[PDB]
Design a protein around this ligand. Structure first.
Ligand SMILES: C[S@@+](CC[C@H](N)C(=O)[O-])C[C@H]1O[C@@H](n2cnc3c(N)ncnc32)[C@H](O)[C@@H]1O
Length: 264
């Protein structure tokens, strides 16, 4: 992508790690607590450059990675965390060209990883039953690209009421309070062999969705797990895990769709 251009998102990091994000606009002045930075001074610079404020405070300038962008969007429905989005893409096998169904669009954080994984030849169909939440996702997804992707369909309705054709999606991902309520729709929509990933914060949700999947009888035995992420301090002889860590985000569940009338 080269040097910074107009319209681009830029991440600024001051001398003690606070991150600031802006959209480059000629003539605009970016304001922080360590001074102000002119957008005109950043437009044209190479990534990884250090700019100086109006008060001399030094700032590192970089293009945000998708994970940086997703974690700094406006307040709204809780975004999925990076370790979980990574495994949804990977264990959910979101392949190039896939047709993916998603429900809860929420803030669109997972949506952006799903769109990146399927690429221009694939498609993402996201349901968001709340109109207000949907506007957040729509705004966040467009803000990553500069415009609405043409391979993204956002449907403002309950997924349970979906009218899409049978077997029209290759992969499905659910992040909502009550995923068992949309399982009949998912079972109809997802093709044979298709992968379903479910993200649930509590063990009561976890048990209920795994048992609902088994009761529907058209799914492989569900696989359920959690991941814990722990940062490390690696400074001279002081090499040790960090003292604070996030204890939990949510559990993951993976299952695959059986063929019409198959058992095992
Ligand atoms: C936890 S948020 C999803 C966050 C999303 N994974 C992201 O990273 O931003 C759950 C979303 O699912 C939505 N929702 C819940 N049940 C739904 C249903 N049956 N159909 C469609 N949307 C639903 C909620 O309105 C909420 O916006």
């Amino acid at each position: 992508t080269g040097p910074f251009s107009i319209g681009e998102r830029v991440q600024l990091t001051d001398a003690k790690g606070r991150r600031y994000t802006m959209s480059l606009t000629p003539g605009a002045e970016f304001h922080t607590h360590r001074g102000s930075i002119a957008h005109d001074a950043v437009i044209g610079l190479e990534q990884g450059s250090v700019v100086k404020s109006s008060n001399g405070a030094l700032f590192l300038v970089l293009r945000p990675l998708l994970v940086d962008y997703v974690m700094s969007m406006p307040r709204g429905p809780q975004v999925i965390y990076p370790k979980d989005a990574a495994q949804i893409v990977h264990e959910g096998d979101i392949f190039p060209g896939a047709r993916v169904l998603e429900a809860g669009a929420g803030s669109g954080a997972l949506t952006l990883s799903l769109l990146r994984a399927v690429g221009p030849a694939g498609q993402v169909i996201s349901y968001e039953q709340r109109a207000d939440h949907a506007e957040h996702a729509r705004r966040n997804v467009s803000g990553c690209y500069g415009q609405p992707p043409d391979n993204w369909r956002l449907v403002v309705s309950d997924l349970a009421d979906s009218e899409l054709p049978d077997g029209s999606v290759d992969r499905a991902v659910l992040d909502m309070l009550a995923p068992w309520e949309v399982l009949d729709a998912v079972s109809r929509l997802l093709v044979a062999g298709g992968v379903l990933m479910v993200y649930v914060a509590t063990v009561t949700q976890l048990s209920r969705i795994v048992e609902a999947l088994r009761a529907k009888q058209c799914w492989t035995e569900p696989r359920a797990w959690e991941t814990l992420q722990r940062g490390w301090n690696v400074v001279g002889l002081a090499v040790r895990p960090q003292h604070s860590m996030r204890g939990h985000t949510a559990f993951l569940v993976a299952t695959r769709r059986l063929a019409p009338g198959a058992v095992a």
